[PDB]
């Protein structure tokens, strides 16, 4: 499948650190673990683009509203 990110990985990144330790990452091959790592990084960028996109609109919404009053 194309650019697949396993659902469990997404859940993992959104959860807290409490049950981190019980991850048997040893069971995976080095390539799969490099896979997981790079997927987290994509997840970061997604969430980052969302954050940064919101603040685009928000800023633009504000300035539009100011001009309106003037």
């Amino acid at each position: 499948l194309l650019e697949e990110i396993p659902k469990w990985l997404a859940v993992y990144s959104e959860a807290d650190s409490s049950k981190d330790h019980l991850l048997q990452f040893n069971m995976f091959s080095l390539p799969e673990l490099e896979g997981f790592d790079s997927m987290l990084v994509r997840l970061f960028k997604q969430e980052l683009g969302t954050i940064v996109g919101f603040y685009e609109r928000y800023r633009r919404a504000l300035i539009l509203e100011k001009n309106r009053r003037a």
Binding site: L30, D37, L40, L48, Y55, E65
Partner: protein, 54 residues
């Protein structure tokens, strides 16, 4: 639409929000950076162990 509530703000309130917007983003991004770094550590530690084991 998404920001309809801004129509209820005073003119100063709008400026005040425009004042705070950058810093507000920088905090958000920092919390994000911290979040993912701590999520990667387990994986990165494992790879290091694989590399040392083999």
């Amino acid at each position: 639409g998404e920001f309809e509530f801004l129509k209820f703000l005073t003119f100063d309130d709008l400026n005040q929000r425009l004042c705070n917007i950058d810093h507000e983003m920088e905090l958000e991004i920092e919390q994000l950076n911290k979040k993912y770094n701590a999520k990667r550590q387990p994986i990165v530690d494992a790879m290091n162990a694989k590399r040392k084991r083999q």
